[model samples]
Target: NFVRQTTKYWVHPDNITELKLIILKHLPVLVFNTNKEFEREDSAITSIYFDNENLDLYYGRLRKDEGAEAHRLRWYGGMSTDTIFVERKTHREDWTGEKSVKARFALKERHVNDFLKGKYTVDQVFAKMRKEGKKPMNEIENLEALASEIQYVMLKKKLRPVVRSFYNRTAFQLPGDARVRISLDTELTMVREDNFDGVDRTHKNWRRTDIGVDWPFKQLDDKDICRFPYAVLEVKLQTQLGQEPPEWVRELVGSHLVEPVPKFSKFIHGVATLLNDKVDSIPFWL
Candidate 1:
């Protein structure tokens, strides 16, 4: 069990420094998932999301429907990357007494077009997994099944790249201390990656070529960009007795330093905000 309920919060830019000062009293900061060879001081992260023209995924995720899934292609550190993780976040309601989870597997960016069109060999990846033997047999099997399932769903539902989100994340966690984790994300920006206007944004590529990991994407138009109002701080908790968290953690969340967002998602907000015309009802966070 990836066993903790994730909580998201909105933090004003002014309070970002103050929040970090308070968190340092309990937790130390460390870099989270960066390529040592080309790492920048700014931990940049970018992801391109997928959805159909009808916005079926958008509506389902916003309403927090059971079995709803958010699919995205993510790369760490920067734009010039060879590996991309095909990830999915599934929503499991609290009524079911199960925590929601995200599962992912890696793929070479060169093969994405063929993969998306259902023309790639999915079995070759499995062969590599079996040869590497780094992870357990069960995990490899699960990932293989997940990759196949995602391919089937994408083809059947006609899911295409629609939105791209960019942000710089600063992560804080105690080394070898797994009880709690904190991440502060700033400069959140969303840009339209879809070619609904017949502009050929992707050029039939897996993703847009106009923009890289560069923040603010200077080349984009106003209608294509949605600059977020607040910085997002995420908290993940693990404890023997669930309700009790670190004392400082409780005070910070309960105080005026942050605002609680019940189930805020960048993917959902990006879709609802940038593609406003296509959505039926506006998202609550707006």
Candidate 2:
């Protein structure tokens, strides 16, 4: 039940030292998950993005359309977890203040495809709650509504897994406000859907520095894959949706430690790298 306003910045590695110094001065706490492996500081995130054959989502983002939307299935670590997430992220430029909303459903891995097919009816979904004497029209009802929306998009758009991305992230937060969060993502890499069979062990090795052609198996240096040389800094203001960024954020921008690249999208960059001809105005940086 978490929602937030977000902005992304593309920053070079050399600038991280200075950027962290500035942010730590203002926001001192490092957010950590309860998972023992990630308890110390950072964690790895993996996501498989879905798009239509024409990559309408990719182009919509590249064009910065008012209502550009993206859909993805995300999970942590390299293997299956108890829960996987299906999310739809939308951005609206025409709102009085910039608008972004992510509606997510946590379903078991086995139920992912079924949920996408809209196989779960209201009665079926609420059956368990009803047995426990829980109300039928509650938070679960609102959540189920989004499931229908996801199913509609999946069927109508004929969306299929297009790209997979991985990165290591360290999260930070404002001391008194749990709603304000920031994360620094490094070692970003993207692979095509055909590169791995979804359970290949080599998928975990993608983070290695020696990801070039010399090594055996599908390497990141392959034509269909790409990596980011810099870190992606993301700031989330969950409570202050339309407010100006805080003073420390202003300092980072003013000092030029981080460049505000409004159109920066990992999904678009991955698609353009693989199918440059299919996309327009490919960013020179990619």
The local distance difference test score of each candidate is 0.84, 0.67
Write one digit per residue (lDDT tens) for candidate 1, span 1-286: 3355568999998898899889887888775554464467248888889999888888888887998888899887667778989998889998999868899989999888888888885787678878987989998889889999889888999998999888988788889877789998998998888887787788997788878876777888998888888899998888765456788898898989999996888888888888787788776776
Off by over 4 Å in 1: 1-3, 33-38, 133-135
Stretches of candidate 2 exceeding 4 Å from the true structure: 1-6, 29-32, 35-42, 78-80, 93-98, 117-136, 178-180, 194-221, 236-247, 281-286
Model 2 lDDT, full chain set: 0.67
TM-score to true structure, per model: 0.91, 0.75
Q: Which window of ten consecutive residues has the lowest lDDT sum in model 1?
A: 33-42
- Model 1: lDDT of residue 44: 81
lDDT of 2 by residue, 1-286 (tens): 4445667888899998778777777676564555445432126677778777788888777776787788888876545354678788887785548666788877666666665555755456446655775655677777777767777887798776777777877777766775557778877877675323343323432122233212122544466567777889987765555555566665666667887765577887887776665666676564
Best by lDDT, which number?
1
RMSD of each: 2.4, 6.0
